[PDB]
A paper describes a structure:
structures of the Mep2 transceptors from S. cerevisiae and C. albicans. function as ammonium receptors/sensors in fungal development. a central channel for the transport of ammonium. non-phosphorylated, with channels that are closed on the cytoplasmic side.
structure using data to 3.4 Å resolution. region bridges the CTR and the main body of Mep2. Why then does this mutant appear to be constitutively active? to be disrupted by the incoming substrate to open the channel.
Author numbering:
A (entry chain A), B (entry chain A), C (entry chain A): 4 to 55, 57 to 203, 218 to 416
The structure:
Amino acid sequence: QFTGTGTGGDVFKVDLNEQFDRADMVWIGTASVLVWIMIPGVGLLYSGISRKHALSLMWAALMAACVAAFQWFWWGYSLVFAHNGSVFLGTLQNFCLKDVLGAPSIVKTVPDILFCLYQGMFAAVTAILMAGAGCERARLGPMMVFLFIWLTVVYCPIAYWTWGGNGWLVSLGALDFAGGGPVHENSGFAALAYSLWLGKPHSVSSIVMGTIFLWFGWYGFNGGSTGNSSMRSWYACVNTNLAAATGGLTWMLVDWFRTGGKWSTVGLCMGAIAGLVGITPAAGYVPVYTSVIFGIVPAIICNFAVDLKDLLQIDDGMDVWALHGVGGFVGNFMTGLFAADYVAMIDGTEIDGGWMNHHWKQLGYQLAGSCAVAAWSFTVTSIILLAMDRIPFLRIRL
Amino acid sequence: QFTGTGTGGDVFKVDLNEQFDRADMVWIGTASVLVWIMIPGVGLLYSGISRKHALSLMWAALMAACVAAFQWFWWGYSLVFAHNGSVFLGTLQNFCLKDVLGAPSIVKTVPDILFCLYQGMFAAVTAILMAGAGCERARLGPMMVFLFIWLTVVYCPIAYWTWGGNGWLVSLGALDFAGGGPVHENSGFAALAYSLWLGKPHSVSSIVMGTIFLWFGWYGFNGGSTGNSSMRSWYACVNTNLAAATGGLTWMLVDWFRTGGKWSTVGLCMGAIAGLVGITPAAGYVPVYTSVIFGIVPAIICNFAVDLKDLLQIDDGMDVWALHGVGGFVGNFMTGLFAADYVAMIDGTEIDGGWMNHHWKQLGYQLAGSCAVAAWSFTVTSIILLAMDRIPFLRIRL
Amino acid sequence: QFTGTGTGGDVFKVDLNEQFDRADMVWIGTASVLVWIMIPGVGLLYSGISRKHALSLMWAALMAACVAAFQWFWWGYSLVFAHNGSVFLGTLQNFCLKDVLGAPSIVKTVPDILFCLYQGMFAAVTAILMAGAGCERARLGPMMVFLFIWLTVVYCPIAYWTWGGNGWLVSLGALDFAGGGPVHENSGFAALAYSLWLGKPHSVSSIVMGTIFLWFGWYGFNGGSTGNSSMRSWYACVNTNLAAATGGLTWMLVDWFRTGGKWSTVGLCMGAIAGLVGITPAAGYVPVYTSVIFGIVPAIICNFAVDLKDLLQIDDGMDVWALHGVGGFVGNFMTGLFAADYVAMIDGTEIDGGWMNHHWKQLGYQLAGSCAVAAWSFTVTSIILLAMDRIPFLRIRL
């Protein structure tokens, strides 16, 4: 009968669905289809935000969704969610997704095959936050090749450290809810390492149109990170939703001060995105009133984080870092403060909490991951893209 | 254990999810994310329909989603869905959403926190049907301030009267399914009171693109107003869907008569919207064949309701009234006729019915709400926006 | 109590929801709203792909959604899903959808009313793959009339043969999962019979924007064809997803060979669509590794199937045939090879399998349907559109 290892059993002998709640499954099923639409969210958002462009990266978002898919089929999933992995990376147990079916996943409440589906949507949103930085006059052929390799040696380590069975941040005692680390910091600082070595209407709608796609999709992103149809799912959604509100209102007032009384529509659009990123690691852990702080604080810190566009000049890919890499860090910190064991308990999840319940040690744990993440995302991103220009016919930039 | 008041219990002592069906919850969770995309539906639809514009209100739709969020966080939810409210308005019991978690809501079949999530999406669609009327050369700063106040003293009373615990239309005996009153009539007649005191391709796609967003989202709007995963949910969806069909076919034939044989693509787009609004208050109460009538009738009555664009001239915000304010009334009336106690009974809902089962008195009850609504939405909208121009530096229009 | 015929019982005497899983229902409910957005997917995709156009068929997609709705209300549903049908067509038992409520449908695991909702979304996507071929300087009035008749005598027979109670392909032993036959082949070869008798940026985004809508929506299309919240739903989604990946990667490499090293963004967009169509009939039956083949093979065969644009010249509607009619056939064949009884068994579905388990006879059965389909879709499409130009005032083309 139910073995809990491999495919979990004989389809001819046992009903593998009996292990799971069909409502928890239905939700993550929905949630899966919602994260995907965040890809042309990045595309439209960063296409429309570019002040300089080689190729409409709204189309180059579809390029990532084919590449990320095949890598994640190939060995991507295995390296993050295998049941026998080390502690730094998983195994290759599931190469080309064989024996991925009915066993409970590293989230015990959905099967491997739906958790492959839903977690596969984060390596793909990461992919377009990556290609999106290095789009300017970059070659197309080697680009795809970059990504495949980058997902393998940069994303997958970080992901297994955060979400993976015997990962070392899970076991340390660090909280990361919907993956600010694996997705925003990973891609915020690997976009920095492109803009150091390989470094207005008629395009406003494309930001906005693009912005809206992301706001919409994050509901599947955060709300479906609870892993079940429970009411913490919907809780995190109330949180997500208003970090994005207070995020975007804050960011509009701030340059309306710093710059006389400057009109800024693209302001509010980014304030939202500043707040969504800022709440990712905390959406299922922090009290609702405190999720306004997660709106405010990363909008401010990221506003000034953009004004570092002139005291070092460079532009191609600092927009990604300005929001996701900073805003992730800011939010991964703030988790350590407001993470409350009594919000976590709404689906029974046991954590020690953060400062909200005098678990002082937590805020340290939180700094442990962000630094490990940022570093790995920078050095190992760096080694590959230098060694990538090294060979002529596999370009990157010109 | 389960107390049914406050947060409903101790997360450390009881499992608060046991009260609810995880499938009813999953659905309204989905449905919630579907109503949201109706906001840039209005935006794109009314931006693209404007014959005259100050600022792309497709972006000014995102402004409403930040403001509506914070107001609804602040005191919005409390005023409509508090468990101890008077009969004209709820209490302030839930200021800044404290003690909103696991108790059954005024819809007993979902928790306060998911019902905050899903019902919060109607105050936000209302918000953009509001700002959307008064967009023309209006100031941005005071605009946000308008809305906040308008949601508080105009929307929230009407909403608590229709949906609220001890509201007086619920207790009277009036049927309103997905809220034609609180959302369309409220915003149809408050858009009239702007165009009295403060009163083509290359923009066709934006109507269409915008139209499509709404048709798509209404499924979450109406279908998720049943409050459960029951098969009345999907019933109302079959209704919604074809009121929009027959709505839009009717509206295309009609000016194809009145105007020689005039081509009208924007016709069909509005006929749909005419029919969606016309079925909102009735989608869960009326037999499917009768939902064609709800397509037809409000398309006609609203077609002529547009031709009042010349026998009084004014334009800025009559498009909103032409569809949602008239079409709501037309549909709130027609509910009283075709509301059938044996459709309501598909999830066990007990009503007296409408004329379909000789409950003659009903059609009166239906007129009681629409008039109360329309009036409150007009007078109290009026007092504020006059007293709003009154002070210089908090403008509205110029 | 539960009678299983008619409306299934007395709403006042029995709870009709008890027959069904509220999670299976919730999903197909969601899935229903996902297939709909595939309509402006076709629209945007084929509008943006047109090298020649009379009227933005992105708006002419909304025309189909009104017409398809009313026909399917009228007699459409009845002809395909009636419980007493012959073997060639169902009955008229459910004319104007009376007595469609709580009985299990021809898929026993959802009620007639939700199965009307969800299956109604395929006759509508078919509708826009139809009108979309014959859009070029065609008249609008008679167009609607065409469709209504075409859905009735062409779509509905094919559909009842594949999905219908006593259909003859179901009973024969043929596998068709999400309906490559009824939807793609039906509309691939009926688009051929228009282009025989009645026969670049600034429009790239519209392909892409349009492409994305379809990729997104297919999850509801294929994943919701399992009919339940089971984990085969999500399985088929993993399949769908990567047939579209490997589909679109293949198609980009291929003209990057055939044409020197030609840049082709519209390539990848179509490769995806080539792969989605290629996996439709197989998504719930074939092993995941084999779903890469379904990506590759129909991308190649359909690439060359486009290069028949010059060795016969004609264009208006060969793009539809190039993808859906060929790609359907290619995929309906390949089902017969890789259909495995042990994937089908994941929700207990009993099939004999295909060649994967030495059921040699299968591949024949598979050819039986595709040919029957293609033929009926051609001859009967032909008779009507010739006899349609026959009468002056009901034009088609000029």
